[PDB]
Design a protein around this ligand. Sequence first.
Ligand SMILES: CC(=O)N[C@H]1[C@H]2O[C@@](C(=O)O)(C[C@@H]1O)O[C@@H]2[C@H](O)CO
Length: 661
Amino acid sequence: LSISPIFQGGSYQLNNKSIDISSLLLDKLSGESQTVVMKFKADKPNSLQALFGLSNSKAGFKNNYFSIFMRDSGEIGVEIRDAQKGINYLFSRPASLWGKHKGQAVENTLVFVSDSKDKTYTMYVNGIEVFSETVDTFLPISNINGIDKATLGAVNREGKEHYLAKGSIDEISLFNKAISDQEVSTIPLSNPFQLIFQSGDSTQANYFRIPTLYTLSSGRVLSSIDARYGGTHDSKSKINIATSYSDDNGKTWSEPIFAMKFNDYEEQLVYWPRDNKLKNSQISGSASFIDSSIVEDKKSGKTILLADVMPAGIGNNNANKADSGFKEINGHYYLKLKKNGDNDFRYTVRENGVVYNETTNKPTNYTINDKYEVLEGGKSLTVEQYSVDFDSGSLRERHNGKQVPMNVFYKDSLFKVTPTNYIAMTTSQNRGESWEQFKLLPPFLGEKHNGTYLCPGQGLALKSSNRLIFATYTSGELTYLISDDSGQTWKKSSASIPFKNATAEAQMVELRDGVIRTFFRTTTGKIAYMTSRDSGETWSKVSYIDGIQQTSYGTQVSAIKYSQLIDGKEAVILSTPNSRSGRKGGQLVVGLVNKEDDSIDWKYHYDIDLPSYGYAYSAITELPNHHIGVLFEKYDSWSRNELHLSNVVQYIDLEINDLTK
Ligand SMILES: CC(=O)N[C@H]1[C@H]2O[C@@](C(=O)O)(C[C@@H]1O)O[C@@H]2[C@H](O)CO
């Protein structure tokens, strides 16, 4: 840092009693710009607590103060208030903090920059920028009328301690300068987590959701994710599937690449609005991919990744449930196309990509190549790309002058697919260094049924055979997709479930050879399971796990078969929020398998962080060194208050002894 602190202090215990630092700090504040650097712990916070306050403590000036505050939800924020100036700034972001990790309080590193030159207030926690707000009328934190108290662990208002804190401030420093983003990056951190995917990386997505992890036979650990461009919204949106891998047991990760991507819309790093009027803004004319899952095939050595594919403007909410998008002729399914100007789907994509007119029974001069792009007499047709912006005060989607290959999933294509959901497949023969062009899977539930929905996370490679299984769901059932030929062909195995309209996200473990247990999200508040004892051909009725709570809408749950005995027994590890309130209270739950009846004793619960801190979708894998890697959404991804947060999908490394303590 280019300058020394005006005040520095440490080892402050905040035990619901403020610490007055007025005489040490107030007369050292000068000029209109300041930086606060604070290292602090709060593993048992109050509902709302102030970590640092500067206030006018006198009668009649209760709303003249600056504070750095946090909530027991993990939210961090500031207030900057002066009643005489008529200013009441409040800037915050949910899900910004860690509480505990491996049972010990985490030291959070907070950096707040108040910059009078740029009229901007910026907050970083744990190296992540969580807000940056420019104002028309700047209020220097010292310029609040009548400030006479500087306080740790409360704000002194009219002589009383408000917003009392429980925690500790291990170090706090203030500077009479707005330090640069570059200087900020030099401040040491004590983070319990890593980032694999992050804002500003090669994906240029500012948001991520739906993590996966899979340990490959080489020892490489692979991860896939939704790179979500238009905020954290599900499709309809612009979303690509990105991947990254680690060759050192998760200590470092490769720069992401794409496994599946569309180019109808630019890859733009956009700061999606979080205000109540605009937060529902959703990219509406882009094709997308959503919800990926990985498996490795022993025979071929291929890595196989599946994901849902959504045509332009389509998502689960508006996909046509009564149309697969294929025509069966006869025994073979051919992708249907509608040509601009036709009200009906007159075409199919036949062998060799030939576009065939169903009404005239003649091939046309158009072909669809292996990238689902349209050619006419062998030449590639193009469309103009779109970009998005909020410069007009609402979301605008507009052509940007760049030509890209015309794809049948695009809004502007001459030939367009049925507006329903599909599933696609890509393979890698180099363990994630590159991905082949995706191919659509066929329909499994007939001509007049939309795609099933891929369960995000892992597929299952049965240990003693060549069988691969990917779970998917639809209304009234799980639909397991089974391949015995390295993913060249798939058949379904349907397993009825006693819920309609469930997002029945399911993950599988092989308890022993040929015996599969599937754990899945329900609408009941409990995680369900079912068992197959014939390698997925047939499935039991549904049972429920006791000792874990979910919300009524549920959350995805990840599950693995651990390779080593725990307490002399075979073990399964589940990862899920454990809360009836929200997507919070993340846990790993270790289940010991009864060798006589395949029942599971859920003997250990490990809290990922505080019960009140967010935890949503998750990925777990046994790393080659027998550690457990967890990549998870550290926020409430259902909440309409926690939309569009950056750098909340995070990675941690745990050992079994951390879980069973
Ligand atoms: C294909 C798709 O939309 N997948 C979604 C669904 O699940 C999630 C969720 O957070 O619950 C996130 C997934 O990415 O939101 C969706 C909702 O539940 C409707 O199924």
